Design a binder for this molecule. Sequence first.
Ligand SMILES: NC(=O)C1=CN([C@@H]2O[C@H](COP(=O)(O)OP(=O)(O)OC[C@H]3O[C@@H](n4cnc5c(N)ncnc54)[C@H](O)[C@@H]3O)[C@@H](O)[C@H]2O)C=CC1
Ligand SMILES: NC(=O)C1=CN([C@@H]2O[C@H](COP(=O)(O)OP(=O)(O)OC[C@H]3O[C@@H](n4cnc5c(N)ncnc54)[C@H](O)[C@@H]3O)[C@@H](O)[C@H]2O)C=CC1
Ligand SMILES: NC(=O)C1=CN([C@@H]2O[C@H](COP(=O)(O)OP(=O)(O)OC[C@H]3O[C@@H](n4cnc5c(N)ncnc54)[C@H](O)[C@@H]3O)[C@@H](O)[C@H]2O)C=CC1
Ligand SMILES: NC(=O)C1=CN([C@@H]2O[C@H](COP(=O)(O)OP(=O)(O)OC[C@H]3O[C@@H](n4cnc5c(N)ncnc54)[C@H](O)[C@@H]3O)[C@@H](O)[C@H]2O)C=CC1
Ligand SMILES: O=C(O)C1SCCS1
Ligand SMILES: O=C(O)C1SCCS1
Ligand SMILES: O=C(O)C1SCCS1
Ligand SMILES: O=C(O)C1SCCS1
Lengths: 279, 280, 278, 281
Amino acid sequence: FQSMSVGFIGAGQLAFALAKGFTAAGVLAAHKIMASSPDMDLATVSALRKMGVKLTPHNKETVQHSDVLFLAVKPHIIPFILDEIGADIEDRHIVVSCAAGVTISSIEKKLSAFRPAPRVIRCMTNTPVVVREGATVYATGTHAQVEDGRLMEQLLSSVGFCTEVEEDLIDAVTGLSGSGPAYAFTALDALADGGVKMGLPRRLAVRLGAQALLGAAKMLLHSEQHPGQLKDNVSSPGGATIHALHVLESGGFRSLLINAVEASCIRTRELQSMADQEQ
Amino acid sequence: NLYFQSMSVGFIGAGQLAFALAKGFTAAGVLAAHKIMASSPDMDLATVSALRKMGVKLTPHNKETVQHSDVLFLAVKPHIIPFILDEIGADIEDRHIVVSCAAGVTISSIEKKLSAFRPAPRVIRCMTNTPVVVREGATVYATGTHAQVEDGRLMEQLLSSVGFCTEVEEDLIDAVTGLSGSGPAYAFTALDALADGGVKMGLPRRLAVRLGAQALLGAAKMLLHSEQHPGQLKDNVSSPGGATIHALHVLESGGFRSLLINAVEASCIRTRELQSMADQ
Amino acid sequence: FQSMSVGFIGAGQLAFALAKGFTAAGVLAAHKIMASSPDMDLATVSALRKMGVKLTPHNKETVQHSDVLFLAVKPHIIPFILDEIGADIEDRHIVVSCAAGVTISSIEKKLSAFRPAPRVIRCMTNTPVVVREGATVYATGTHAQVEDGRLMEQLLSSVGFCTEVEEDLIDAVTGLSGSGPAYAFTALDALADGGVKMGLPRRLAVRLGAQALLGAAKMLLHSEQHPGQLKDNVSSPGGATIHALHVLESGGFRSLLINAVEASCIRTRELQSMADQE
Amino acid sequence: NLYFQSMSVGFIGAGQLAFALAKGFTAAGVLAAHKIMASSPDMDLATVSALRKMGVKLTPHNKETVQHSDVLFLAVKPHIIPFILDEIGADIEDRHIVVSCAAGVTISSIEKKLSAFRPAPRVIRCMTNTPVVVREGATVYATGTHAQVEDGRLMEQLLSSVGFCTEVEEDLIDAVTGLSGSGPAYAFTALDALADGGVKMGLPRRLAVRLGAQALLGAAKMLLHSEQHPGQLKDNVSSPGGATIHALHVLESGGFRSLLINAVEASCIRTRELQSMADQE
Ligand SMILES: NC(=O)C1=CN([C@@H]2O[C@H](COP(=O)(O)OP(=O)(O)OC[C@H]3O[C@@H](n4cnc5c(N)ncnc54)[C@H](O)[C@@H]3O)[C@@H](O)[C@H]2O)C=CC1
Ligand SMILES: NC(=O)C1=CN([C@@H]2O[C@H](COP(=O)(O)OP(=O)(O)OC[C@H]3O[C@@H](n4cnc5c(N)ncnc54)[C@H](O)[C@@H]3O)[C@@H](O)[C@H]2O)C=CC1
Ligand SMILES: NC(=O)C1=CN([C@@H]2O[C@H](COP(=O)(O)OP(=O)(O)OC[C@H]3O[C@@H](n4cnc5c(N)ncnc54)[C@H](O)[C@@H]3O)[C@@H](O)[C@H]2O)C=CC1
Ligand SMILES: NC(=O)C1=CN([C@@H]2O[C@H](COP(=O)(O)OP(=O)(O)OC[C@H]3O[C@@H](n4cnc5c(N)ncnc54)[C@H](O)[C@@H]3O)[C@@H](O)[C@H]2O)C=CC1
Ligand SMILES: O=C(O)C1SCCS1
Ligand SMILES: O=C(O)C1SCCS1
Ligand SMILES: O=C(O)C1SCCS1
Ligand SMILES: O=C(O)C1SCCS1
């Protein structure tokens, strides 16, 4: 009953996932969302159009429509966008940057040249908001009101987990839960290949592997136990599971997942350093 | 609005799986805890103490469980199954459906033991996993020689209340064991390691565990609810030149995919090997 | 393109591949093509002569002859070429650089010293244009007219896939489809060795492996499905294919192909940095 | 072409291969979809749906497919073949050509089953692949003891309509399985990974997939049309000091060639071992 108007600058995968999640949650009407993109011939744009989201090529129209304005363009596009519509940001706006790596400081520096106290929030979310099981963190900017952070948390909690963090954690969150779903999709493809190798039909192997991962993740979320203790409860002495865990260990399975989180976090920091030098 | 008002369930064995299934069934509301009985020779077990708190009836005597129950879950270690069947075989009656949850143990071996006492024992073999405790298990089952059509439908109805459940041919169950039976342990290992990675890059451990588990849960749900290939969903996360595709490369460089294939294979092979030792 | 005259500065592998492709496509007459090289005794020069292309040692003759001018020399030779013929570029010319790494900016700066508004196109293609199955991208320069891009796409679409890109994608394209045929030739040699190890005659193993790769690539191009889904359709449970896919995975096969695209792209960027520093 | 004038074709099994062959045969125009019949127990498959839309006649009864067809393709999983041969063996007649597509299954095992019913079953063993669906398959076949001369000629003409086809001795078919039978899956894996490499270096995924597939198709076509060795063609791409030779080094450092040899070998060996388990049983 808030009747919030939401805009997305950028009408790609994340704008679609968030719009789909918000509308499935019943927090927003699809036609109260407006998204802009210069390439109005993407599949994401077509899917947004079918949902009933309003679409325009003009970023200024998205700004003027919006109360909450999500920045959902590639990180290197954010400064061009802030130059373009910075004069259109109003005191009523909450600007939510979803761009990987882009700092609140960089955004406020651009926008403060126009109005003195732009309300900026930075978030890192992930594509599972599309099924309302996202993992979201956010940090509040210099001029964001206490009510702004609470509004953001309410909105993003409707599509998954949401919590406030200090901004200096967000690049690490990006490497864990931002990139996380891609590690899981890779793992599920491989587990299914394993099931197929041992004689299962592919359709059944995909379903079983995905259900196994979902159930295990839910167990851990609902348990106060260490993941190692939960692992111990699966493995009977001499049994099949502990034999399988040994071959994972012999390949350095754990180290590969640590490598992945690190690589994603470092690349996030490295891109932003490139961005800050280009300014 | 499901409820089996005339069904008494028993567990021979009162360990991790018996607890998980009993907790799942009671949370589902399809069974009252007092209609469940579990037996174990060790009544000083953490799982036994937990089943007590739920209201499950406990006894040291497997014969008591058999006499109380209609649906009888065998939830003991695989090498104990033949001793259990020798012990209570004379107590199996026409009304009993015997559901073996033991990894690897064949319908054939169970029916041969029980048929020495009374012909036509109704046997079902199932492979489930511990997430039935949060009603997100993955279960397959195969029906035995003398199981009636209504027996398998009833068991699918019961096991569907605590997660995914489908009928399979028995010769797929050892492979299912390697995938979704052992799968939760692969996930717990992966979540421990992902959290270590989060901590390495500066996150508090509690938050890293929560975010990693939420990421895995959400991705699995996305795939279950999508008609798209996991590779296509992966492509939607990875923007060109971005952080995710850099991370995917280092996974590939370590043969990440091959390790998970190795694991499913190793668990399946061990399951087959253990049963061959049992039958020899 | 009946009135169109095409020239190649540099008469080596790529010039032959494009001229053979163009003439087999019927979009160009061989006698309307001229190519120049210093060493008129190269094997590519002789093959070009056999198909009816006009040949000359003088790059200025090529320029005076043609409307569309392909630069098909090694990348470090481009600046020397642009200095030699810059004064002969006219308003009618479309200069198409095929050189790996070389930027539109560097070409326009050299040519603009002689005449303002040179019409420049940068492209990255590959050798399979010789069988009209090339993969080509192009970027239009500052002063290229809109019809210039449409003309180049029409011409290069006759010898394979062709699409316009932003210039900052071209170094990555170079690592993928520019170098890609070499990855495929390596893979085909190895697959044939595998067939021979298992008892096939070499000639048959080469033919079968190449047919397999061609068919699979065509399947993917004509399908809406993800390559992973097509892989799923081949491998039956417990079967020979999924066993072989495992051994590829155990060697990090996917990671090696990622390494290759990366290494070729990085080397391309590195070489242009040395050119721009010089 | 009088071979196909009035010929009817049947598929026992209605999965990926049956759809790929039926699609290729009809696209080639060598066969009308209504002259093709397929049978499968579970009509709940996706491939059974597509075959319906093509105009292919479907039925659950394998005996009906046998009665309809002159050329009978066996397109079921290898371990089902002896069960199928028990079921329809008394229905195989003199006029049938039985074409086994099952991996590993020997002409000998098929002829042993069918010869218990009628003395001279005409059997052909083939190994094809899924790109017949785009008429670019790679097919080999071996002729059985009782296959007539025109039988192999008929088979060759039919399978040549959807790609390369040549006759081989049967002892080569397990190795062909490891090379061109499994080969498309190696290519699909390689294209997925090449596209990941394009994406890592900044390309949109859609363009990376298109460029990688076009590169592989073009290189394969080049080799098929050239008399030159693959290494000489590789040499023509690599300029001294250039990007390609740098990329080839990193492939070599990972043993890229050996992985592909490993794959052909592993598929060939699994094919041999599947059959040895079948004939022991
Ligand atoms: N996809 C994911 O998994 C997640 C993405 N993100 C972040 O969200 C942002 C976008 O992510 P995707 O949606 O995956 O990118 P995407 O590339 O799918 O969509 C990007 C959109 O930006 C549009 N665009 C380009 N220039 C524009 C301009 N000048 N004005 C307006 N729109 C313009 C493009 O047309 C495209 O529609 C990135 O910053 C990424 O870091 C963060 C968390 C997860
Ligand atoms: N824990 C898991 O992840 C799953 C286990 N299973 C199967 O379930 C069965 C049990 O698994 P867990 O519960 O993990 O074992 P567990 O070891 O936690 O509990 C085993 C129970 O058997 C009891 N027991 C030993 N001898 C007995 C006897 N003579 N009579 C009665 N009870 C006796 C023990 O006291 C204990 O309560 C095994 O066969 C295993 O393969 C299958 C799927 C998943
Ligand atoms: N071979 C390939 O796979 C592809 C090559 N390219 C690019 O095309 C260009 C050439 O490729 P290749 O034809 O393989 O080189 P190549 O070395 O086969 O032929 C190069 C030609 O340049 C000639 N040349 C040298 N100095 C000259 C001068 N001062 N004036 C006129 N001609 C001169 C040489 O005599 C030779 O004929 C390079 O820039 C390369 O990056 C791009 C894509 C694919
Ligand atoms: N898909 C491929 O890449 C190629 C497959 N092959 C061979 O072709 C055969 C099947 O290939 P796919 O089509 O991939 O198998 P698939 O499993 O996709 O379809 C197999 C068909 O057999 C049917 N079937 C099972 N039992 C049956 C019965 N009793 N009567 C009639 N139909 C029955 C199934 O319903 C299914 O339609 C296998 O032997 C395989 O080795 C060989 C070359 C390539
Ligand atoms: O504990 C074990 O190893 C068996 S029970 C879970 C899957 S296999
Ligand atoms: O493009 C990317 O990889 C960013 S968006 C998802 C997490 S990081
Ligand atoms: O699917 C399989 O593994 C067999 S059928 C294609 C070649 S081998
Ligand atoms: O020869 C080379 O390495 C360059 S030109 C073709 C791809 S990159």
